[PDB]
């Protein structure tokens, strides 16, 4: 509910906010935190960051390396990396031997690495890492700024038009039932099918309207809690 929402905000790419200080190179992960404290850099922004000895790089980074005429073993020495400060912070929670993870974390990928840790590592490391994730997750859930307000739940603009078109479509069936050309039982089956199609159409219009940065969508896309049809009947029509 909260931990997964926090980590999703912490590890996500830019444009979620104003990505200030993006596209620059930093001497160490410590210096990035210095820039963040001053407010120049933001937590979600692509940056070039160096990395101390012993931190394993990504599995696909093992064949490529830096440009030198000599053989190199980049697996446990210095290496730059294209990432965001938040992803650098997140990886420090995981144990040191673990390879770097560079994608937005969500819920499915989050469950995977816990499952991966349980297989390849001793029990004590698994228990300790979850506590680190708990602390980081709760801390950033506060700073994430998810809320609810009357202006957060935006009704689809197109909706009003979409419902009226179906009503006119509906009404001919009602009209052609008044003249006896169709039985009521057949009419009920045909109307339910017509209405079911309508609920999907207004869902699609609403799903396009919402921006990815607002609270209500963010805590469903992340896998925190809720489901799409629940979000539909708060803003779009409930349906049958």
């Amino acid at each position: 509910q909260d931990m997964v929402l926090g980590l999703f905000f912490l590890t996500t790419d830019s444009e979620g906010r104003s990505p200030k200080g993006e596209g620059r190179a930093f001497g160490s992960s410590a210096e990035a935190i210095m820039a963040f404290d001053a407010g120049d850099l933001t937590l979600q922004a692509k940056i070039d960051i160096r990395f101390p000895v012993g931190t394993i790089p990504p599995r696909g980074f093992e064949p490529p390396a830096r440009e030198e005429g000599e053989p190199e073993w980049q697996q446990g020495d210095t290496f730059t990396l294209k990432t965001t400060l938040g992803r650098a912070l997140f990886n420090e929670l995981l144990p040191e031997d673990y390879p770097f993870v560079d994608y937005e974390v969500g819920k499915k990928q989050l469950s995977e690495i816990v499952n991966d840790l349980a297989e390849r590592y001793p029990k004590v490391i698994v228990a300790a890492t979850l506590d680190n994730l708990k602390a980081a997750g709760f801390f950033w859930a506060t700073r994430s700024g998810v809320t609810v307000a009357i202006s957060d739940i935006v009704v689809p603009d197109a909706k009003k038009e979409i419902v009226k078109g179906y009503e006119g479509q509906d009404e001919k069936v009602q009209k052609q039932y008044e003249r006896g050309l169709i039985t009521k039982e057949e009419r009920t089956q045909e109307l339910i099918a017509i209405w079911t199609k309508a609920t999907n159409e207004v869902a699609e219009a609403m799903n396009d309207n919402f921006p990815k940065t607002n609270p209500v969508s963010m805590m469903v896309n992340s896998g925190a809690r809720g489901n799409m049809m629940q979000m539909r009947q708060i803003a779009g029509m409930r349906g049958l």
């Binding site: 609810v148 809720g226 629940q230 979000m231 708060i234």
Partner: peptide, 13 residues
């Protein structure tokens, strides 16, 4: 806020 969307009671907001 995590409670409010799922329980469908935006009357409290």
């Amino acid at each position: 806020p995590l409670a409010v969307p799922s329980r469908m009671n935006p009357g409290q907001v």
